Symmetry: D2
Subunit: 210 residues, 4 copies
């Protein structure tokens, strides 16, 4: 069966660039999406198709997408189990405009190793039990916020960014994400720039690939 | 027999505004019974060498070395002995001290505020009450950025670049570890009116 | 009318001794029961009467008494609202063997100042909003565990492996999951505990002002 | 050139058992002391030969061995760069009683992979930069106190109070002021310790890979 590696951390902690660089160093980008051995799956892709009431809160702008409720916990469990069985899965493409899923999906052919990363990857116990390796990218809220601002502004407004952060992100991260850090088997600090760490994991995957 | 109150915490944690609102609520805004001393006005006179670094934003104003600790210790001892004292007026444009000085007369209560007010054991032991305004690195950086940009007009990337390189390291290595010396911890900052009024009424009970 | 002060912190943090040394320094120990101006209430005396299944789990040492489910939140609310109404409240007495309340209940006459103390004093919004001042005694799990072990062998006659094993399995998780997160509602954080005299005298002098 | 792995964390965090388990799974335990490819060095072995004034403090039970000055950085630095140079080395043996090194030394023959394990392994830049991989075993302080109590009480038959008084007085301050701040120099953080098999197998295999 495929080797499932759960990766978590806060937004802009690097959990994404770390996964992106892992598959890259493994030369998976030079491989056709049809034969790929190592694939990256994002929790962001599994956003819940909002109900009437939820979109009414999002319309106003008070719907926290970092809250564990914003994620389709069941679809994620379903999808991961199916990939375990070695089957092929259909990863949905979210239409943030309508807050529904576009008809357009993403096909993920059975892979040897699967990297599932998200801010609440370890939140659900059933999802957490499916991972055979649990990694948490630990980066100070300090640095993360700094990274977050530079990214968003360079086209979001500075005031808006810090306001959404203080009002919604910080609180959601501290209440649901941070507490899951205790589930990790391995903690990777700083992120993408931690070369020694990245290579340790790419080598572990390589061995599995042989 | 002035009652010295030391107050620390990171910059942008609210320590200055807290001290401000504390004396403001006391209407103490020559005959002052409660005054505010800021560790800021005790920076060391910079050398022509360190000054060149400062104009290049290469000088760490948050490192203990940037403060004249001896002048702080001496100034605070004399205040404890009821002596009037002369606090310097720093001139950042020249990075040395201005000829003029602020005269502070013996007050019954003195509030010494600074990011490293609890750093030197000698200074620390002169405080009869030590307060630490504790706010999250998160919130703090946000306040710092908004202020640096909206009030001081700095470039965003330079604020964060410097924050990562100098402020954060300096805070974690020298400031944060002094928190354990506080008798009372005030969370969030200037908006914690319950805490603010707690120190007010207390400062008032001393004045009477 | 009564000034309600909510006090929290982890078991062993020193919250109890802090509250105790507060009334003591106020001379309230030398005051008469019927005339006491400041009194201390413990969330403890408000343990929930257990069901058949929870008692069963309790006999096997598996019911975490530090989980919020262990406290009778409803009664805590009603009792505190009455105290706000300047009414005389009747405090229940818990019997640990039967895991229920004895018929004997203690009476608390309307005092000017009430200190409500417990590990989950700020856990419920309703109870929390009743306090006009929120205090959290913050002592490192380190120091806290050290104190727990010492007091336990001596008075509780328990052994090390038991103390530590219960701490690892039940206290620590419950303290981190439920107590610690409520610290953010504190107006003032009192570190270390009852030996923080500067902090102690601060609350003591503030209370006296109220009494005057 | 030998691959140097620095391992740190607080005492009783699991750094020692993590290293012990690693070499064990690598079968190095059945290998002759002269045919070993991966060995373990303890900062512990490099305790510094104290002055007359420091044995005075040590005599009065006031010298903090968890302080960076209690470790001989020159000898550690010189010893490591020598293993680097592929040379053979002699690791001192300390009698933490007389506070001096014996004449009796342990022999370490050039190895492919070295594990330098210590509470202050990343404290000195000179030393820290020699490590190709830096690992920090992160374990909660209360959990660490739990293990320390059980271990210390079992062997030295030291009275509980001594163990804790010392901990609060010297161990804790030292850990927080000098060890913890070095965790930011780690490349990988291994939580909890010896029972973290996944992290363990991770390092084991990587080592194996180097050995081929």
């Amino acid at each position: 069966e495929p080797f499932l590696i759960g990766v978590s951390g806060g937004t802009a902690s690097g959990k994404s660039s770390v996964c992106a660089k892992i598959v890259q160093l493994l030369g998976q980008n030079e491989v056709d999406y049809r034969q790929k051995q190592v694939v990256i799956l994002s929790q962001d892709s599994f956003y819940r198709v909002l109900t009437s009431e939820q979109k009414a809160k999002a319309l106003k702008g008070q719907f926290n997408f970092d809250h564990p409720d914003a994620f389709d916990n069941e679809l994620i469990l379903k999808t991961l189990k199916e990939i375990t069985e070695g089957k092929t899965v259909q990863i949905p493409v979210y239409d943030f405009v309508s807050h529904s899923r576009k008809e357009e999906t993403v096909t993920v052919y059975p892979a040897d190793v699967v990297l599932f990363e998200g801010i609440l990857a370890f939140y659900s116990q059933e999802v957490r039990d499916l991972f055979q390796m649990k990694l948490f990218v630990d980066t100070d809220a300090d640095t993360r916020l700094s990274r977050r601002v530079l990214r968003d502004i360079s086209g979001r407004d500075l005031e808006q960014i810090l306001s959404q952060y203080i009002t919604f992100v910080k609180p959601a991260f501290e209440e649901f994400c941070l507490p899951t850090k205790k589930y990790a088997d391995v903690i990777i600090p700083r992120g993408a720039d931690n070369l020694v760490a990245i290579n340790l994991i790419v080598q572990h995957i390589q061995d599995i690939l042989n």
